[PDB]
Amino acid sequence: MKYMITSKGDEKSDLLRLNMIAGFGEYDMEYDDVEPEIVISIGGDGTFLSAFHQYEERLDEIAFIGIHTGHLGFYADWRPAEADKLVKLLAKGEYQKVSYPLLKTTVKYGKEATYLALNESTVKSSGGPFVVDVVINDIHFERFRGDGLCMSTPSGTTAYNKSLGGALMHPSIEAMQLTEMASINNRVYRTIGSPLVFPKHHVVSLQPVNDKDFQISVDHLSILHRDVQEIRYEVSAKKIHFARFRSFPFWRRVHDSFIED
Amino acid sequence: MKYMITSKGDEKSDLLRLNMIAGFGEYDMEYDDVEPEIVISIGGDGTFLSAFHQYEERLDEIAFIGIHTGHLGFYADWRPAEADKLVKLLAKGEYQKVSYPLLKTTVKYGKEATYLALNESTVKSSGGPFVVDVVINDIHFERFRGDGLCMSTPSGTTAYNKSLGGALMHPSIEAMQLTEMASINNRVYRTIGSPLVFPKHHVVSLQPVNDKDFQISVDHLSILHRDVQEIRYEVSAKKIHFARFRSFPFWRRVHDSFIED
Amino acid sequence: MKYMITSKGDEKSDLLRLNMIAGFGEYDMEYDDVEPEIVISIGGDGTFLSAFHQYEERLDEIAFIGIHTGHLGFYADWRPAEADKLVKLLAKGEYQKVSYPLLKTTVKYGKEATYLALNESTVKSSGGPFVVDVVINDIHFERFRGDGLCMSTPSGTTAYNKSLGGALMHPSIEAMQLTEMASINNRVYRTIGSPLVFPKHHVVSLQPVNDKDFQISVDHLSILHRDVQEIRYEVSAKKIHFARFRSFPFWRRVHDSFIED
Amino acid sequence: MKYMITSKGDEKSDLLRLNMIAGFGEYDMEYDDVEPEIVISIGGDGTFLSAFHQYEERLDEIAFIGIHTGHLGFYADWRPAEADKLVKLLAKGEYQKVSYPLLKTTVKYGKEATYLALNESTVKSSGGPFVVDVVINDIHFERFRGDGLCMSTPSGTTAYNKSLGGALMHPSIEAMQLTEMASINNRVYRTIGSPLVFPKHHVVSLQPVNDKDFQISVDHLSILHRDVQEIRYEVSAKKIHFARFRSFPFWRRVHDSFIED
Ligand SMILES: [N-]=[N+]=NCCCCn1c(Br)nc2c(N)ncnc21
Ligand SMILES: [N-]=[N+]=NCCCCn1c(Br)nc2c(N)ncnc21
Ligand SMILES: [N-]=[N+]=NCCCCn1c(Br)nc2c(N)ncnc21
Ligand SMILES: [N-]=[N+]=NCCCCn1c(Br)nc2c(N)ncnc21
């Protein structure tokens, strides 16, 4: 199969990449970063995020693999000492795949721009106060007033969603979680406060009240959008496919990253 | 069909019950509180909880309906003014049903006792300090130290789970959420802190460390269990079936109860 | 005495201002917005904040008064219906004063800039990730990693400090409170998480780790500072003096704003 | 001076106690556990709590010292390796003292019982639902509905108060902090949610609404009180006096216990 390898850019990740290319050169494996069926990221979860968005147009044709040359990552979750064994079983093929849900973010202008997120998408205010009306399935739910909102993927719950008090969902649950950032709550302004978990086909809409410019982020990318009229959140029909080669449970992956290792 | 009606016991709930029995007497409807196919609770969510556990041995043969004579409830969510229209469309039959996930709680002794919960099951310490080892899918996850733990159903997320910082899940998501109660976290003792959402077939086990007596609650019921050896939490294969007669979205039901009405 | 009146700028606040000037014209009261001893703000807490920072160079010579033409404010906490009675007892003089603590914020460059805050001062990152070392009384306390930090005055605890989970302090306590914004906590990075309350003379220092550009806010004002080397927080020796004319307890003021009114 | 030493009861704490008595026997130091001026606790913070309440009738005549034979404590905060140096400088006298605020808890029946707490006092419900009206300085503040309340001393903020989201106050601030336990908040029932910090002479009163039986705890002690009519919280006029022998800042003590050591 075709393959390619991204690297964090530091010394050890580049050297581990060339070592796997040399190991791949001993098999029926052609290097190709244009039409690959296997994408390997070496470095961290951020390096994996770049590899995902780099090939987010062909998600159904790629099995992703992450190698962490630093601390353990939730996507780059295979030690460098297992690089040589990764190459062989990848070269055989006939491995099983695992798929995670993704977040679909739509932005409408007075024009439309859609995005896909592996971790989360956030909405903050371009300087001024952040005020939006939250619409769930065409029903007005609340008028949010604070620092912003964060809609997280299941696997993204361990990232920014966790710092905002959100819960950690197992990535086999096709859903999305919304969390609040420093919400103002007084006798006249009311937010739900609790994080919200939405199943598939549930559409969460954010609609402006005053300023129509929001700082919208999607994973690592963050762009200021002007004259915004609506932000639509829903579980994406597209999924990301990992190459499963051993057994590393998500809760074990959560334990090693936050409890002890 | 056979039917029965429970009442909160106050004046208006009893009078609304006799009015529906009289309205039911004008149809092919026999009253029977032993083998009913339709159970109506009048009062509040607590009155509905009693009706559920009263017929929790025959959940697949009953469509539940809740009427709130007081404030809006998440299970008793139909106004008394709609009692006369409930009777007629219930008498016709040919309504659609909706099903919610339930929580299965297993307790092992040096003997076994299983339970079903509509909202949540909690574990606290019988006087002394609460210490348990949390085991997720036979893998040790953490050693919890605090006031206790709460495993909530999807519909139960709006109850005790909400007061503990847990997220609100849509009841169409077959899952269960675990929350922490006043967990102690220092340089040597570590808990995850974030709430955890577990899909079906995921088994969460609580195992004692010192004292084997815990105050285990299941919905409104709470019993002190002695010489406890294991507490097993998992999404139940059994479900509760409501009688759907109009359109009352869960998020609309959340809005009316916490934001404004 | 000399006096001046600021107004929110809308119709009713301007008309209430001219009405008090006319009422003041019936006494030994000269209007002067350069050297006043009594400053009246009409509008809201934001209008009061502007009046404070407008005369923050002469705080020991001014008694402040706030009138809310909208909802109740914690500084603008006197109804417009009491405007005519405010004018008379202000004209008599011989009222008692009440004083609140202020926050002193120092910023050092490779040059020094000091500021005074009535509510709080916040530190966020200019685009990139926010990382600082927190130094309390010259002892390294923690390496913070997240969205930012907020040091609040006692009276400022009801503002942004409250949205960040901070506690509400009575303004008679000469202290300052620090709160965290979306702090990242994993097995390798650790923050205290709890808000911290510091007495007088306690100096809290924030020191950069990578980027030396921070978005530093002080009350409503927010300015991007570049090549920052240190941010020093401490309870200010200066205080703000209100003109006490009735009895409005802080906890009563908290009750009317968040519980019910 | 007279002195006495309490011990956790395990082997090393008893042996360290007899070693200090033998070291004290080489000075003008008489052992006396009835009228001592110096009390030494060996073990942990719990052992120190027992020593405090054991001599809480003569707090103005005693300088307390805590030795931790296990992990670092906030009261037992001197290593066993410094036991021999503690004995000598204690025998010289002429050390400086440091004093911490205490919590005064009053309970009224249809009779009165007062208590002193070094960490905190908690109020929970004897089985049924916990509902109280919170009265601050004779003004009704809120109707609390949840699991209970916790009023903490400044030094007690690092204990149970920290697990409940409360802030950490420096013990030089004569104040008390109130925190909420799993408070229920819906459209009809409202709590402040934020922790509250009260200065001296501020009296916080809890008054029953239905059940007059509460599980009231004071530090380690916990007693069920029946037919309760009022619970009064205020900063105590009495203080605890430690024997200062080196320099161990409270924030350094917080750092070593929660961040790293
Ligand atoms: N706030 N904040 N947090 C930033 C986390 C950055 C590292 N990181 C990435 Br990039 N993705 C994940 C993920 N899915 N889970 C956990 N950490 C992750
Ligand atoms: N802590 N605490 N909270 C007690 C809530 C009691 C009322 N109540 C019942 Br009973 N069941 C539900 C439910 N599913 N959602 C919301 N309120 C509910
Ligand atoms: N986040 N956020 N919150 C902004 C609050 C703005 C209104 N406001 C002002 Br301006 N000052 C105070 C104060 N001291 N207490 C309460 N509200 C206040
Ligand atoms: N929940 N819960 N937490 C129990 C803490 C028990 C140990 N411990 C004692 Br006993 N007193 C203190 C104190 N003042 N600070 C920190 N830990 C303390």
Q: Is B210 helix (H, G, I), strand (E, B) or coil?
A: coil
β-partners of residue A239 are A101
**Residue A160 CB coordination number (10 Å):** 23
Whole-number Å distance between alpha carbons of D198 and D201: 9
CB D139 within 8 A of CB C253: no
Residues 6+ apart with CB under 8 A from A145: A129, A130, A131, A183, A184, A189, A191
**CB–CB contact C187 A146 (8 Å):** no
CB C192 within 8 A of CB D259: yes
* Nearest atom (ligand 2) to Cα of D145: 1
Q: Is D123 close to ligand 4, i.e. is its CB under 6 Å away? A: no
Q: Which of residues 227-256 of A touch C (CB under 8 A)?
A: 256
Strands A30-31 and C214-218: unpaired
CA distances from C19 to C4, C22, C33, C34, C69 (A): 13, 5, 17, 21, 14
CB B225 within 8 A of CB B213: yes
Cα B19 to chain centroid distance, Å, stands at 28
- Burial code (b: 16+ CB inside 10 Å, e: under 16) for B230-248 equals ebbbbbbeeebebbebeee
Q: What are phi and psi of D80, to 5 degrees?
A: -65, -30
Contact status of A98 with chain B (Cβ, < 8 Å): no
CB D79 within 8 A of CB D245: no
**CB–CB contact D71 B183 (8 Å):** no
The amino acid at residue D121 is S
Q: What is the DSSP string of D148-177?
A: EEEEE-TGGGGTHHHHTTPPEEPTTS-EEE
Q: What is the DSSP string of D33-48?
A: SSS-SEEEEEE-HHHH
**CB–CB contact D187 B260 (8 Å):** yes
Alpha-carbon dihedral sign for residues A156, A160, A162, A167: negative
Q: Which of C118, C125, C114 is nearest to C240 (CA)?
A: C118
CB C250 within 8 A of CB C157: no
- After what residues is chain C interrupted, C–N > 2.5 A? 110
Rounded to the nearest angstrom, the minimum Cα separation between B77 and chain A is 18
Q: How was this structure determined?
A: X-ray
**CB–CB contact A187 C258 (8 Å):** yes
- Burial code (b: 16+ CB inside 10 Å, e: under 16) for A189-227 equals ebbbbbbbbbbeebebbbbbeebeebbbbbbeeeeebee
CA distances from B145 to B132, B166, D166 (A): 7, 18, 18
CA of D158 to the centre of ligand 4 (A): 6
Q: Chain B residue with minimal CA distance to A174?
A: B173
Counting every residue written for chain A, the total comes to 261
- Chain A residues within 8 A of B173 when measuring between CB atoms: 173, 175, 197, 199
Q: Closest to D182 (Cβ–Cβ): which among B181, B185, B256?
A: B181
Q: What are phi and psi of C114, to 5 degrees?
A: -105, 155
* Ligand 2 pocket mutation, candidates B47, B53, B75, B102, criterion most atoms within 8 A of CB: B75
Q: What are phi and psi of B250, to 5 degrees?
A: -60, -40
Segment A207-211 long-range contacts (CB within 8 Å, at least 24 positions apart):
A207/A132, A207/A133, A207/A135, A207/A231, A208/A131, A208/A132, A208/A133, A209/A131, A209/A132, A209/A133, A209/A143, A210/A128, A210/A129, A210/A131, A211/A125, A211/A126, A211/A128, A211/A129, A211/A131
Q: Is D63 helix (H, G, I), strand (E, B) or coil?
A: strand
3-state secondary structure chain C: CEEEEEECCCHHHHHHHHHHHHHHCCCCCEECCCCCCEEEEEECHHHHHHHHHHCCCCHHHCEEEEEECCCCCCCEEECHHHHHHHHHHHHHCCCEEEEEEEEEEEEEECCEEEEEECCEEEEEECCCCEEEEEEECCEEEEEEEECEEEEECCHHHHCHHHHCCCCEECCCCCEEEEEEECCCCCCCCCCCCCCEEEECCCCEEEEECCCCCEEEEECCEEEEECCEEEEEEEEEEEEEEEEECCCCCHHHHHHHHHCCC
Q: Roughly what angle, to the nearest 10 degrees, separates helices D83-92 and D11-24?
A: 30
Q: What are phi and psi of C18, to 5 degrees?
A: -65, -30
CB B40 within 8 A of CB B4: yes
CA of A121 to the centre of ligand 1 (A): 13
Nearest alpha carbon, ligand 4 atom 1 = D160
**CB–CB contact C260 A187 (8 Å):** yes
Alpha-carbon dihedral sign for residues C30, C33, C37, C41: positive
Whole-number Å distance between alpha carbons of A21 and A6: 11
Q: Closest to B190 (Cβ–Cβ): which among A136, A254, A260?
A: A260
User: Token pair for residue A131?
Assistant: 């005020």
Whole-number Å distance between alpha carbons of B237 and C260: 44
Residues 6+ apart with CB under 8 A from A104: A114, A115, A116, A232, A233, A234, A235, A236, A237, A238
Strands A96-109 and A112-117: antiparallel
Q: Which of C60, C54, C57, C25 is nearest to C40 (CA)?
A: C54
CB D167 within 8 A of CB D177: yes
Ligand number nearest CA of C8 is: 3
Q: Which domains does chain D have, with CATH numbers?
A: 1-101+238-261 (no CATH), 102-237 (2.60.200.30)
Whole-number Å distance between alpha carbons of C164 and A182: 5
- The alpha carbons of chain B give a radius of gyration, in whole angstroms, of 20
β-partners of residue A130 are A146
**Residue D126 CB coordination number (10 Å):** 15
Q: What is the DSSP string of B110-172?
A: --EEEEEESSEEEEEESSS-EEEEEEETTEEEEEEEESEEEEE-TGGGGTHHHHTTPPEEPTT
CB D158 within 8 A of CB D168: yes
Rounded to the nearest angstrom, the minimum Cα separation between B176 and chain D is 19
User: Token pair for residue B214?
Assistant: 């815990």
CA distances from B170 to B157, C160, C186 (A): 9, 31, 29
Whole-number Å distance between alpha carbons of C163 and B192: 23
Q: Which of C111, C186, C120, C193 is nearest to C153 (CA)?
A: C120
